[PDB]
Point group: C3
Chain length 383, copies 3
């Protein structure tokens, strides 16, 4: 087709915003959650795995994720972007922009995992994990949801990655936390308050970059991007208030960490729904995502019993799940949503949402397990 | 009408930039000005009130600020954005983008106040204040200036919010500082130098986001946005140099805080003028705003006698006032400006500018007072 | 001509991104490399010289850099932007946007120098240096490369400033480090690890802003901007891995500083090549730039023998040189590049690249020397 310069402009900036989410967004976020002694190692691992993902994406990730193929993966006709004319158009933008935008999603997904596990995993081991998990979990899932694969064929609703990014990463991260133990030093049982401003800063950057993430998923600076933008604002705000409210009634006082976690919970929750729901649905998904996130990290604390950066997966996993399910409800026009596909009823959509969640959790869990084992058996996992 | 995708793209990014100003811009700015013990509380309050404002804005703020009504407020036909088709166009962009862009302005305005007072006001009290002040001061004033209200009917020139945002917030903030006392610990009489890099970082983020703030106010990626962009660069630079020069001749040495305050002074000063003046006028308003800001904080120091985050209101108020008045002068074509409205002479424009300033100061001062009293009488103000 | 709003939108945001690179990008970058005692002074100098450059740019920098004239400089027909209608179009955007975009390049270039030397040079002395060097080195070189000057007439390939920005600044910076000594306190021989997160944050911001820097140099949100965007991602990633690999085999372990330096090396390296090469060429230039950068700082360490912010010039200079030369190779279509100009062979292009490098190094070195001497003779250099 023909590229619309406005969309090209919008999508390259949105891509920049998404990249901003990982570098330095996620890094600053986790930087404030981990003990100073491991921050440098974590930043190094986030930076290098980010670089690794960028390369793997252009080499074959894009071709296998977005190339046409079967229900689980594409092809290798676009290795190193071969056979893609610079003027090739995907949707209403130059395919090259589509490559970068999609590549940035792969980056933040990996960032979510590495940023949390970096401190407990050997450097070479994380590299092996990234290669395996990106290649066998992210790419297939990305293809299944956005590459016209399985989940897409079933009509799974996931505007910006509730499954591909959040649930996908949350599971890979939780398995990592399960397989790799971590020694909590004395006095380091709770997140250091003095470092919370960095968590806030990371949260803020993720929030800002998330607009490129959510609105950019419209693929064009149109009314759907506008809707996604507004829902992102509302859902995030709603989740902050919801989490803070739940925390207020649960602890008698709100906390900075709670407010930030709430922001993330709403961002994760609205991710799959932003372009399919109305502002009213965004507010509701936001409040629920915030309360669900609080519930989620509270449960993780019962297991870990200590503040751990991996608590982040509790928010991404739970809110990712909540948002994905809620999308199946609020996508309805009766609720101000965009509507379901042909012959689709809310009941059927919910089931498809559950299937997507189910498949993502299992697929990512298995691939991650394999990834961690391969790393362990080769160079050794735990530091 | 029909939405121009280029403008949609421009305005959603500008909205992201403005949101960036509050989260984390203003938070980092104040974070570096307040004692470490209250930073966490301040960040929490900024985050939650930001969330609160985002919600109140979509629920009724937008409808009452931009809906058509009388000279002080709009209507409630757009509660929760009801009756607004996704494809509805406002100007040359989708109305939904207009909602978010305008909502982000409400957010930074509230951020300016809360970021400075957070450390001295009870959490629940700030929430009550925000609701009251946003609803009764920001919304009406926004409607009066940008919603076709009173000030707009009189031809008040305020491109991006010299009154709606800066003077409005400056007054609400100063009243707060007047009503709510603060105990200055020993050794905490001056801003901690070690924390100045965060003030610089906050300033930098405000500066960058300010381009979306000023240029985005053009409502379109046109020559007016270009002008506003260039004037923002120039006025900011001019104010930095002006403040630094004034500080150099007043103290024998420039300071980081002075350079940052200068940047803000120029940003505030050019805010109402950016799209109506020439680059020459921007440079002049910048130098004057910088010197006026220095004068302003110097006077506040004579009253407070101690470094206080509320000194920020001195810059916003004074430079806001200076910029608003200067707009009435440099908008003239003889001075390279865009020109005055029909039958308008510089003398008449100045008077209208003064009236807008006068009305904003009194309206905001009264509403803020009421807001603080209501909060005090209900849950208690001072921590 | 007629302005394309999409391009106007793209270019104003790209300009914002480039400005973001200096404020706070470069400031945070250097902030983490210099001892806390001089950070405040450095931030102040970066902020003020940034302001100074913004002003000098609008006053005469733009007219002399982009105005039509001879092979070394333009004219003064655009002083203070006089004679430039607001609706004047340059390329496909409003000239005013072109002014700001180009002005932001001048800002980051000066930022690269001041951020590194600030701690060792007197405040008034840096101001004098900036005026002299910006006026006599940056402007002429900018005119020579982008103002249709000498290097442009010879067909020098430099998409975003390998010479104008990086080599230009690297030389001016190295001369400064050569002329101005610095006392290294005991225990301050190596960069403080505790401050590395700020270097990472600065690097991240430079990286994100660099997209506006590289892609924006296309002057339009077209396929060339898309290519530049993708190459920036790839080259940066490749350089991170290359540097990290070289560091791993050279020291047995990667470091955060190495990963960040690698990012910069790739960004600098691809700068002149991004819009002329293929993704394959970007990856190769990236790996080479990363290894070359490591080699470069390693050599500087042999001379300085201590960690010094000026080591940054080693990366910009070397990678700038490497990227400029490599552009002459990978611009070839056989290599997936865009192709050489008329009657141009790779061999001839390489020579022209070398000439541009040669001329830039000498021109900047001489002007900087003069600048530092004038400053020294007038107010004194070293603090």
């Amino acid at each position: 087709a023909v590229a619309d310069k406005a969309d090209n402009a919008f999508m390259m900036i949105c891509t920049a915003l998404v990249l901003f989410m990982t570098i330095p967004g996620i890094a600053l976020f986790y930087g404030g959650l981990i003990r100073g002694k491991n921050v440098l190692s974590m930043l190094t691992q986030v930076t290098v795995t980010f670089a690794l993902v960028c390369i793997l994406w252009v080499v074959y990730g894009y071709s296998l994720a977005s190339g046409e193929g079967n229900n689980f993966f594409g092809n290798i006709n676009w290795l190193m972007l071969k056979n893609i004319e610079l003027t090739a158009v995907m949707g209403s933008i130059y395919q090259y922009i589509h490559v970068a935008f999609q590549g940035s999603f792969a980056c933040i997904t990996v960032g979510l995992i590495v940023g949390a596990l970096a401190e407990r995993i050997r450097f070479p081991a994380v590299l092996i994990f990234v290669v395996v998990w990106l290649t066998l979990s992210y790419i297939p899932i990305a293809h299944m949801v956005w590459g016209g694969g399985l989940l897409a064929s079933h009509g799974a609703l996931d505007f910006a990655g509730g499954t591909v990014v959040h649930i996908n990463a949350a599971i890979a991260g939780l398995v990592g936390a399960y397989l790799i133990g971590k020694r909590v030093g004395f006095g380091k049982e709770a997140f250091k308050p003095h470092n919370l401003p960095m968590v806030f800063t990371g949260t803020a950057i993720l929030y800002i970059g998330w607009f490129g993430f959510n609105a950019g998923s419209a693929g064009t600076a149109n009314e759907i991007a506008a809707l996604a933008f507004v829902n992102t604002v509302v859902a995030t705000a709603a989740a902050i208030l919801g989490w803070i409210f739940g925390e207020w009634a649960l602890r008698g006082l709100p906390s900075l960490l709670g407010a930030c976690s709430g922001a993330i919970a709403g961002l994760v929750g609205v991710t799959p729904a932003c372009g399919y729901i109305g502002v009213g649905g965004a507010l509701i998904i936001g409040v629920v995502a915030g309360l669900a996130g609080l519930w989620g990290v509270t449960m993780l604390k019962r297991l870990l019993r200590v503040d751990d950066p991996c608590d982040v997966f509790g928010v991404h996993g739970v809110c990712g799940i909540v948002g994905c399910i809620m999308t199946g409800i609020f996508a309805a026009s009766s609720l101000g949503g965009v509507g379901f596909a042909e012959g689709v009823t809310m009941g059927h959509q919910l089931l498809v949402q559950l299937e997507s969640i189910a498949i993502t959790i299992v697929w990512s869990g298995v691939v991650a397990f394999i990834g961690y084992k391969l790393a362990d058996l080769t160079v050794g996992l735990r530091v």
